[model samples]
Target: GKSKKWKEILKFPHISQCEDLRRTIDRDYCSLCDKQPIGRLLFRQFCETRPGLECYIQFLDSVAEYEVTPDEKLGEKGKEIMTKYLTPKSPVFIAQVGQDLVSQTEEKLLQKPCKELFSACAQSVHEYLRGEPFHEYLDSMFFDRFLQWKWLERQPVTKNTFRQYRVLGKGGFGEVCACQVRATGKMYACKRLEKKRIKKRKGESMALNEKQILEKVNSQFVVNLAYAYETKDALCLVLTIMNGGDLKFHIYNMGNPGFEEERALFYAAEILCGLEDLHRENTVYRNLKPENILLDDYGHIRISDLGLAVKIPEGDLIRGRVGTVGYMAPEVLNNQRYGLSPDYWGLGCLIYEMIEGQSPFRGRKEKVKREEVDRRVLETEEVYSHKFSEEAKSICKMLLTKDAKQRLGCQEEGAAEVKRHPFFRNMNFKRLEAGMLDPPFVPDPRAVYLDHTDDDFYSKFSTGSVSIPWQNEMIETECFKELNVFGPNGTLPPDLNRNHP
Candidate 1:
């Protein structure tokens, strides 16, 4: 209820700030917004909408007029604030301050001036804002601006700007390599696609689709595409550098019994968020497997490889035999049209692998035939390991159900249903989504998470590229003007630049 109401307020159309605020609030709230000095001033204007906190604007106004208000008038103004908000006399009183503070305010009403007057009431006013609903709403608005700061890099990026290191992995038409941006001295994973290969394999549509999708998405749990540009021979996409490598490496090559229960729970939760982010954009991440899920430096998961992902219209079903064999859902393997439910099935397979050390349906051997894996996914039911806890088994089974309608996250609430399961009862999902909590497993800093590769394999390619084509796709290829973005000198747009107090 609180989320809905605040969401409505964030959608207010009359102001630019509301539009900016709506952008961030619609997405997961980030902690970066609060760090902005301008956001603090805008926050007061927002609080005025609250019933009991209508005087928030007045409080801010008084703070701004401190220079105009003579030192002698400070006592009278302090008393006025006390009578209106700190006391019980006024009907619109915001009794956020304690009785002890009220008594002290009465004692020092004449001792302090305008600055002191604001100090006395400012803390109390903020106490009201610190409440869950107000704090979350404000934080949601701040989160949007934060994204604009870090995400809106409008510089013209090219292959020459980066120094390519070792190759990371290969995909349909190209390989991902570790690269560092020479200007910023920041490392990123550069996914380079050969134009000739894309044209040869008729994969131009898929290549463009992946780029378009990557450009639209900005989630903590998904691989972020930072710079996208093209050269005559190759197309390059500079993505967030995930030093720890993919989940496949950690599960099979780490030389352990795979992930423990706690580890699985944490990874599943992050993956769940990543899936939800895609689903929210009307996109289905058709490919969901250990190889596609990567671990960052912090051991947090980010879903990569969007080649198979597709965006469908509202209330529509997409048909395609995509994704890995063993992880595919019954609907997908049956050649029937399906929605996002398949991703949940994939999630089940992933979590199962995390604890059981392998896919639920795959044979014990390293190489299970594609036909056999499909049969197991389509006809057979999975048997849980003895190590699976009761809650773990419950979530896995529900997610792996044959009927999409009966799937754990296929319902109206989507991922919310899965997040509420007993398996994640101990997880602080809100904090987890906001990236406020520490990961259960932090990747070893000294370990190399990539497989061995030769420089000769990628010697032919040197550049990166951009997106999928659609009839109405809003293409934004040119770099944004530096004036349009936040500046190093704190120069912001007029709507967000001014300070009220």
Candidate 2:
């Protein structure tokens, strides 16, 4: 409908009159006209006298092929037309033209390059745009096509079912339970949000916001949003099951995640890539902590939980404070204007925690005043102990900067700076992006100790093995639908299918 309206506007008789006016006016000044200053002055007077002629004159001036520098102002009539008609759609038009230019330039470059060079450029473009939002540009279209081709052969989970196991962990949002899909027979960590609880606390759209954020992001380092649907009571999010559990579990188990610098760097670099992607989209993972980072099947870390994530407008900084207590950056804790730097700072803290088994600045032994703690955190050089490698300490120092502007991981050179650190000397970042390198540690198949004989501290959370109710009423009423357990054929009933995925 809008296109038709634009077409009608294009066909107005004033358009042709504008061309004629330009031809008759100043032939040399306007490319459409020959040099005739007398006719131009007469035409200007005619335009001034006639109704709607001002618009025509303005149109002619806009199309006039004069090399006006930035300092040269549009004439009074031209400015009037711009103010009247050049609305928000003007930038869209200019962007379309720029896209056309880029396409032409790429075509010429592609034709001249060797096959390898072309391939390299193509790969670079793919990597660059992978984290960008869905757009109609040729590069984005090409990336979409590439992803389609790559994931096509991979198995698709036709039926979105959740296999509920014991509770993996609990937090403020809700409980994360171990789950498996009956369709693909794949296990996942199902995040069950109490809709009533969320509504009572944060209003109606909290669950919706989490869903929207997760659906927008698709990356290897970020937890995959496998499927989502809501019932009258609760909202369910089927996520990629992390068998190794949260980073906190790993750190706690090891007594200190220890001096595995390569492993630390590997996970850190991946997290950086993910954070960069989030920042590019103006989305912030406000809650960055060891507990939120989970290990996928392959043991690679995947950041999860978007309940606190907010999509910020471009160039606008986030000022409100919302995050876990210990992991928050100083600027965020102080309620100062902050942006993506807080996430990086939290990342540095997580890295330090992984190595030192404790927070760099937070400790129970400290009896210091609040302002003193802040001052110590701000001014101390030995925030992260030297027990860690030089590179690890350096990254921590850069991230722990109290001034948000001084935080690392903001520039192209920033990731590179961390990359060049000794901790990550053996890591091939390019290979990591390509998914060629394997993670250093792999969890044992039986590492999950739901029923424990180890009698360790983790065993305290591992409740006594009790059979989950399997009665038909339990299946039909609470446990089955609550756990997303599918039937033998992997399809829910007709009504269930109508509502849930």
Candidate 3:
């Protein structure tokens, strides 16, 4: 069978190069990926020769940072923008965008007043870029650093892949523990959902929803999922580690009068950004409290625990009542159909807690009943303490508004309206989103923040007296077998298969 033809064979000595080569093979092989991915790598190599692409990216990035402009100044901004980008004569003209859209925008801009002056351009760009690989290429190149790509390229992860550590937190169905990948030694928060518990509690929908939402959204202000896999007994979700702990610990345990106004303002701004990002995905975080917000190594906030989160499409509403006691919005408590506004109310409660060291509806030592908390929220107006600054009090009052329609972040402009408030006037949102601004609180390295509780399974379960063989019926379910809710891309449909209990 020997032939005269010879083929080149190569071997990699460095571990990093092997990783690089495998990822190279994946990029070239995927039909969705371009032969040459357009990103930092390509830009660096041909930046001098193909300077136009760089300029195009820069212009688009600048436009992304562009926000709402007033009508009086809209004309001025439009003329300035048109002269620079819309005009064919301009050096930085983006020819890919529609001419009809540009002329229509120009025609509307020439008039005295208009709505969505800059957003039209932004929307146009978004629509044009949707379903395009270059967008994901740029993200993988610049932001994600191909870490996400590496995860997808690898085979399906399993329970054995991680070396389990001490428990960080727990719920009715699962435990969140610090874990390390055996091969990479990279750390993650491994959330293990017991199949038995999930089945008994009727939490399969919640489990699937959380994983799916985690898959769709990636933001600086939100926790991200790295991997999702199922075992014979449990479903595991490996999330980005937040070692600094939850804000609840910081507010209650850190000091007496809670954070400084500057610190509270910073946290508030970040939470707002997080809520904005979540709402952009047409999702509502049914629960938003200090306990759900966690900090990373750098002390930045990541809104964690999407178990109660749900997607409510435009013009659709959900009557499902869900949230923490004090933070639940009036509409949610009343079981009224709602969308996006409940979290703003929760954000208000969070701001109050951060600044005043307690929820607006509860006293420091009351330890009140759930109904009492709900009654206070439903009937009473939140009385801000003198400790609150004028801007802080005003923002809180508006956000805590009983009517969701009049709420600060619930307005037509959404988070932009919240940003325009005087409370955040000193904050620079672009820098905040880019993570250029320093956090007010950096957790002490020596501090013991997480609970050291270990799970029976993780520590190797044992039975001393019981000798009978035990079988977990929940693990033998037919549902989990056909289930494909594994990672970012899975066979499972985006829509929930069944209604949540």
Candidate 4:
């Protein structure tokens, strides 16, 4: 794959202008590298690794220099001379033509391989020599070639800044780990996501959207993204660590399964602030659950997971049956069109869970099917058997209303309207936002980790789909073993070495 001028380029057998320089054999050698150090550096860097028009440019760069001999002036063309060009202090170049080509040099230059590597950019080299400065032309192609090489993450050089440790939690993407800064030893959580899995789920856009949303949210209530980078295979998000364990973990250890009205109000207020910030940015934090909320050393919780979050146009309804079952809004479960209101619905469910200890649809006396839970969500009023403050129950009813238009926080004022609800009337959001009030409970370190490092995180990466599309867990029975399709010990390959054994 030589360039358009391959035949004419091959005709030039001798290329160096300096007579003292001996002829070098190899397709890479033109007139350039023979006399110039920088040219040689650029040659190996751009043309040496792979084959194409790129390599040809390497040889041609040296060849271009040969056109101007040691004694040649800037304007002179070749009796082709080898000129030394490097430092500005002293280029060590000659000023004229080399009169003796046949007798002075018997070097037969091969210009083929380098020419094959040349592409559209190879023409730019000629354009530069005709008018552009040498140093500028050299650097011009460095950036042009840097991204084409392997290593997709594009952040390792930046990644070296942080030292990562233990897996904090796991999700479908990968582990969120505990990490510390190399320069300052400051700790942070690194939410690392694999590009491979993201690609399979076609979640690249979601990944990008997540980063954008996290970066946009600077509120103290939403989990903060300090920095974002990626490894070759994974996207790494540097987040402020809230080591005070999530809501669910603390419930059993300290508060038993549910929060009293007094305590849940504080958390509810904090979460409302987070939701406000999210809606202010025209985004929906669809994945709301106990697992997605984290408590800091301050004992205040911040909304964390944004993987399923999406930004919506001003009046557009986001499509998709995405989100966890218990927490998802009626619209999400039913595939109906909806907007930011669904998140308010989710908040209503979470608020109930926070004060009462179980999801609104679940109860101790009766085992409810997931189908029944979803049906009631769309058709029935909010249900919770456990007692909450009268105001708290009113707040829950308002937030969880089946009609999106009537749901709290779905109004023109949105969160502002919800803040006026009876339950939050006693709570001062101003103090909550400013952190004036202290947290009632700080998680003891003993309760934070407790053998929950997600040991099964990577085992399922081996086979089948990594993503679970269904909300319910299905137990596959071994009754299918009677079928003849699979081999006796499972689809084992035919024993080719059976005779040898």
Return the top candidate by lDDT. Answer: 1
lDDT measured at residue 480 in model 2 versus the true structure, 0 to 100: 24
Give the per-residue lDDT of model 3 (tens digit) for 319-347. Answer: 88877778889999999988889988988
- Model 1, span 249-339: residue lDDT tens: 8788873547888888898999999999998998999788898899988889899888889998889998997777777888988889988
Which of the two, 3 or 4, has more lDDT?
3
Please report the TM-score between candidate 2 and the true structure: 0.56
Which model, 1 or 4, shows the larger TM-score?
1
Model 3 scores a TM of 0.67
Q: Residue 225 in model 1: shift from native, Å?
A: 1.0
Q: What Cα-based lDDT does every candidate model obtain?
A: 0.67, 0.54, 0.66, 0.59
By summed lDDT, the worst window of 10 consecutive residues in model 3 runs over: 465-474
Model 2: lDDT equals 0.54
Residue pairs clashing in model 2 are 25-40, 27-33, 27-34, 163-180, 189-241
Task: Summarize candidate 2's per-residue lDDT along 11-68 as a digit string, tens digits.
Answer: 2121222333323433222211112222233234334443443443443343331113
Per-residue alpha-carbon lDDT of candidate 4 for residues 373-478, written as tens digits (9 for 90 to 100): 7887778776655468778888899888888888888888889988888898777665567676778787666555312222122222211111110000000111
Best model per TM-score: 3
Indicate the worst ten consecutive residues by lDDT in candidate 4.
466-475
In model 4, the runs with Cα more than 4 Å from the true position are 1-157, 364-366, 384-386, 445-501
